[PDB]
Symmetry: D2
Subunit: 251 residues, 4 copies
């Protein structure tokens, strides 16, 4: 127990699915957690479902909102003390080829998936450096950050950007002895109530030519690698990509 003793984590998109499992396991391991989401109705209920206000709170925020990031860090420090841990998990998807991607779809997906991760990473380094917190920025960077998908053009762009921008941040933090690590987590297909809402999606994702294990993962599969990366167990890991994909990228 207590693998995140004393840690203070922000988890973007922490009210559902992968983000909620990360928040749940973070609280179970002794972190204080601020989860973000778009909808107070979902977010407040999610926080209460996991624990008490001394353990977990909700902050309504769109990760694309630059000024809101300031308010989010300030609210988390007011609630829990200085932030040690940021999981940039909030993301959206557009099911279009590059050929069929409208510029509106392109800009909207990059605002969340790329600007959001940039804004959170930049502010995280500024607020967490040089405080002896054992600080950790975990960027959600997808198997779509390693391989293309013909129907996820803008998503591929965003996840490749997060993958290599995270290495830049990791290096600067390491060279300057900031006590901040930056790593990416690369989920394969994960069962979420959302996947459950797309008829035939889980079966298509489970075909051996997609996921060799012949089934998709579960939110806890991503939560456990995030616990490792938030913990001081991973104090020599920075600038690295952690893939949990049932073998998708191995073939």
């Amino acid at each position: 127990s207590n693998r995140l003793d004393g840690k203070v984590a922000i988890i973007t998109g922490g009210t559902l699915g992968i983000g909620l499992a990360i928040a749940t396991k973070f609280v179970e391991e002794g972190a204080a957690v601020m989860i973000t989401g778009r909808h107070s109705d979902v977010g407040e209920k999610a926080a209460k479902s996991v624990g008490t206000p001394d353990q977990i709170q909700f902050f309504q925020h769109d990760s694309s909102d630059e000024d809101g990031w300031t308010k989010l860090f300030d609210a988390t420090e007011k609630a829990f003390g200085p932030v040690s841990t940021l999981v940039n998990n909030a993301g959206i998807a557009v099911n279009k080829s590059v050929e069929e991607t409208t510029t509106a779809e392109w800009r909207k997906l990059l605002a969340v998936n790329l600007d959001g991760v940039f804004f959170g990473t930049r502010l995280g380094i500024q607020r967490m450096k040089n405080k002896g917190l054992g600080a950790s920025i975990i960027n959600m960077s997808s198997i779509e950050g390693f391989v293309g998908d013909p129907s996820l053009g803008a998503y591929n762009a965003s996840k490749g950007a997060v993958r290599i921008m995270s290495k830049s941040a990791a290096l600067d933090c390491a060279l300057k002895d900031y006590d901040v690590r930056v790593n990416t987590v690369h989920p394969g297909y994960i069962k979420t109530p959302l996947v459950d809402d797309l008829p035939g999606a889980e079966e298509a994702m489970s075909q051996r030519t997609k996921t060799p294990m012949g089934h998709i993962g579960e939110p806890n599969d991503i939560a456990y690698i995030c616990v490792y990366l938030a913990s001081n167990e991973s104090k020599f890991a920075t600038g690295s990509e952690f893939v949990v994909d049932g073998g998708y990228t191995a073939q």
Copy 2:
């Protein structure tokens, strides 16, 4: 000779350095070439320096300008007939860590380096598919698309995006039998009049801990791999990364 017989190429940022060497070798191999740049004074002189208007022309264009891409394809087809070949070479750099990157710098660099490559790739697929041209989109994607640099945060983001968005486009074009290939070229440090304007830059780039060959490359090093990728010699290459870096990424 004649390795690009009958090809019609657009080269963005083709008036200087790497882009001009690509344009020069493309014309030498029998392609018709439209080069783009920001400044008619530089661009018109560059085109005339390489060949006659039947071989090479200039089109003034900022790669971030979405509507200008339409005019650029229309001008190239009017001059030379249908476009077969696009080199997305235009790029800018910001020498900032992620921590120190202003949002203005972030948006300006992504407008050229990421939106520009998206706009050119999307329009290229639409205009070049299903015409039996042996069409080839060559995206400039940098060693900074493989490894971080602590002082090139936004540049790293842009080059990782180009790397994996190019794989998406390659796959969609391959699966749909579009007769369009999409590949990335990843230069290491290359001597340009620009590098020459930064005192100490070439020496720093030439240190064995950076470039193991102990010197930097020249624009022709990038021109020759682009000739291969534009030619029908590379008709089975798509979705691949071609690195020419004096060993930078091998260590």
Copy 3:
């Protein structure tokens, strides 16, 4: 606590340094452990230093010895019951360029580093498949499995082989529902009594152009990622490379 409840692990080269830290953390998390080494004098003392014979024992074995692998699996099952977990950690190094590598050095290093990992992986799949153990093969595959070192030619060959042979094994195990996962761990430079015996080694490894964190790791850094991979926490991870290198490969 108890993250390896009920697991039965073999750790090759488990009597010193990285392997001993993996054995120590495995026992702390409730695994039964058989450690191997060449020297009974070191191995027996190492096992007793960690725990009781019901928790940890020593088996004298050179990982290059094909027939000894049979005896090692049989001894582990006799002591602890069916084997769930194999860490192929035993390795040797030759400090020669490819140019200067003698064929004797080549064959000796590949016998331990490649044949040993093959023999253990092959026998592990045969003995651990289809038993509902949540079986996990963790192959030690080095940052030298990603990048070259001019003075580690044969070592580079061995670690690249382990990296991609492990993906083959992972895929076959996944496609056949064997309940066996196969992953590689890629340490950067780690402080061991051995590194301590090479004057100037740790300082050279700690230079920012080598390890950006400006120091090398410790055996526990490798132990903690191995606990994750042995545990059921990583039940969706197979065919993946886990890098813990202080940023070595990120630049």
Copy 4:
């Protein structure tokens, strides 16, 4: 024409398929070529089919034969003058999972695919360094050097080894100003009389879930990238992987 003016190349397994296409294009571009194979009957006819003895000769050799490499370099220098160019192309395949691989199959495949490439690379550096030849070692390293195949365990081991051992050699040659470059070529599935002898193979390889272009390549696809890498056009490329796979590894 004349892209390999004055080059003297050894191509192992140059009597059939990929190696013969590389030899053919090398001669067409002005190289003198020694091709190797196991069978004088095939090899002598192959050499005569391509050109005159001043252009191309055959040398009977198993790439696993260490002493024969000495005789091969000596014969090539006697025929053509000092060797500038080595293509380590000779290889064999075993269609077994790691689980099902016999130790005999393992040792036989590694003798050709790994020892052969080591022996040729080591001797190539020794004989070609510091002679101003613009020397180039091209190691055949397969898409099976990037991704696993559940039924090519030993082949995966060999191709991952070649991939990263080649980076070691490239770095040492670059750091020591040897005038020797070392790069790997990674074919996807290529139509050879051999593939033609395996009923259903080409169709299985052509499925969109394997090769997105929906067909396999031809030997000339590998010949053209080898011409680039042998030529002085690629004088800044070392330690790099060149993939020609119809999109296999992009998904």
